[PDB]
A paper describes a structure:
AMPylation (or adenylylation) is the transfer of AMP from ATP to a Tyr or Thr/Ser residue in target proteins. Interestingly, in eukaryotic genomes only one FIC-domain containing protein has been identified to date, HYPE or FICD, and it is strongly conserved from C. elegans to humans. We demonstrate that HYPE forms stable dimers with structurally and functionally integrated FIC-domains and with TPR-motifs exposed for protein-protein interactions.
Almost the entire structure of the HYPE construct is composed of α helices that represent the main secondary structure element of the TPR-motifs and the FIC domain, with the linker between them consisting of a single α helix. Overall, these intramolecular interactions likely result in restricted flexibility for the molecule, where the catalytic site of the FIC domain and TPR-motifs are accessible to cofactor binding and protein-protein interactions, respectively. The initial TPR repeat in all HYPE structures exhibits a high degree of disorder when compared to the rest of the structure; this is reflected in the high thermal-factors for this region and missing side chains where the density is poor. The position of the inhibitory glutamate (Glu234) in the structure of wild-type HYPE is consistent with its role in competing with the Arg374/γ-phospate interaction. The structure of HYPE shows that αinh is held in place by the rest of the structure, and weakening the interaction of αinh with the FIC active site could require significant conformational changes to move the glutamate away from the active site. The low rate of autoAMPylation of the wild-type HYPE could be due to autoinhibition, consistent with the mechanism proposed for a number of putative FIC AMPylators.
Numbering used by the authors:
A (entry chain A): 107 to 208, 221 to 433
B (entry chain B): 105 to 207, 214 to 434
The structure:
């Protein structure tokens, strides 16, 4: 409460830089502080950050749903953010049109394995897949992760992308069998049998994983999922597979391959979440676990625009 | 010219020159390997050097073409129970050496653990050395300038035999089809995870042998595992049973790859369950090993059973000498 009142004294005087640090400290000490969430929200609106403000008012109302200062702001920002979000998707739709009218295989294998902790370079990955000979001084596990990724995405492109019909549970297992096959052939293509902790997240118990996955693939084929914008649907699918955590390993890699399978089936190019975005990528997943999937959907959307901007660099 | 080479070999055998006779006998068989008269005459010739095992093989080979050939029949009826005894006597020699090896032994056995992975992969064409295999399994880091497939074959072998030792050797009950598939899932898994632990779906040629069609593989494997658990297989000497199992899995050829590796792991699973140590067929014996499998495909499994038996005696002699 003292750090909040200290942040308000700075905001009233002028010092913006010292206020944000004092605001962030009050939320680090108590992240469910209803009054600091609303005051940091109205503060962020002064820098034209309405997306952040709405996040803060929604976080406030999840704790105290009848908080007058959060409710009065939430109700104003809610339809406004919905529009801002729709407008960014229509910007992405026009860039997909321009791309569709108009080397990268190794770049995606590099970022999908590097974001998980793999120390192999792009030139080393190229040597592994072109020659099929080992890279000196690197672990065989890291080199097998690369081989399995190449197998998984060659299978998706050859058998799943252009195929007509619903996505099955067998397709998810077939992808995982190739992702984790060369590293762990015993556990590759089969569900997790033990309960674990993933950071600060407890996924479903192994006895609930099969049903949770039957429900997930039922959602993937539902009309509600089709009605969504491809970028939202691709992002929600990615998140839900990471939430279920159906395998002991290779969940992030399979969820990123399912995400691009959804995008490629919608006429979008395959998307890459770069190594450098590891921290940003885990921050939005944490926020989705805490209660709001929108920051994640926006992170995936920005990833699609950057990919389209790189492809739009040709006539 | 085949009949002339036979009569030329008889001329030297009658006079004396035995070195020139064997070369002339072998030439008549190279020209025509289904020559009934040269097989009997070469059989009687080999008995003069006290080689009754070779003689019976030759008369047996001659009667698989012409079953009523008087000179083959009269000698085969004579040598048939004779080799049966000689064969039984070599197994009892092996049984006494198994006893003696059951009376550093643990450190010496694990010292030749990388030694078994080297020979089972080297006999299949793998170019990795024993020191390279040791680096792969101890460090889990890659060996420079070698293919990842060859290095994954080594990792899969280590996984397969660590799984056999930890969950199958001391296990009670019948051997299942799932146990064969589980071994294969580890043998091939790191090389080919798509085909590892599943039967072959295409028809192929393996040297000069056509194995069962993929639509018959499941039924022939159900029949094989039924034989493995039968009382007839239990009544056999462990060395004969281990060798016959090895041969029958190689004959079926149930997987697209790793058939030789899995058949040699099942061979030792049978031996270890019988109180025998794990056996190794060395890289140098590649040609001898394929010669006895060819003879078993042609009609006689005995040379193969004798090859496996001499492999167990050499393994027991190494264990009896290392602890001396």
């Amino acid at each position: 409460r003292a750090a909040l009142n200290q942040a308000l004294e700075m905001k009233r005087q002028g010092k913006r830089e010292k206020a944000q640090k004092l605001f962030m400290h009050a939320l680090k000490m108590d992240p469910d502080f209803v009054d600091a969430l609303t005051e940091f929200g109205i503060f962020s609106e002064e820098d034209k950050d309405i997306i952040q403000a709405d996040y803060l008012y929604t976080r406030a109302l999840t704790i105290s749903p009848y908080h007058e200062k959060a409710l009065v702001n939430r109700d104003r920002t809610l339809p406004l953010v919905e529009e801002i979000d729709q407008r960014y998707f229509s910007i992405i739709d026009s860039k997909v049109k321009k791309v569709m009218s108009i080397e990268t295989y190794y770049h995606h294998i590099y970022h999908t394995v590097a974001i998980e902790g793999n120390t192999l370079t792009l030139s080393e990955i190229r040597h592994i897949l072109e020659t099929r000979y080992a890279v000196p001084g690197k672990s065989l596990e890291e080199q097998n992760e690369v081989i399995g990724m190449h197998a998984a995405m060659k299978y998706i492109n050859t058998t799943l992308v252009s195929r007509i019909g619903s996505v099955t549970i067998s397709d998810v297992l077939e992808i995982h069998r190739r992702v984790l096959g060369y590293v762990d052939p015993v556990e590759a293509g089969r569900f997790r049998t033990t309960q674990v902790l993933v950071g600060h997240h407890i996924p479903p118990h192994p006895q609930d994983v099969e049903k949770q996955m039957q429900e997930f693939v039922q959602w993937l084929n539902s009309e509600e999922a089709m009605n969504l914008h491809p970028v939202e649907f691709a992002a929600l699918a990615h998140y839900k597979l990471v939430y279920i955590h159906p395998f002991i390993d290779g969940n992030g890699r399979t969820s990123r391959l399912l995400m691009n399978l959804i995008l490629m089936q919608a006429g979008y190019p395959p998307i890459t979440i770069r190594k450098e975005q590891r921290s940003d990528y885990y921050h939005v997943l944490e926020a989705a676990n805490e209660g709001d999937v929108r920051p994640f959907i926006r992170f995936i959307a920005k990833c699609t625009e950057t990919t389209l901007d790189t492809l739009l660099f040709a006539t």
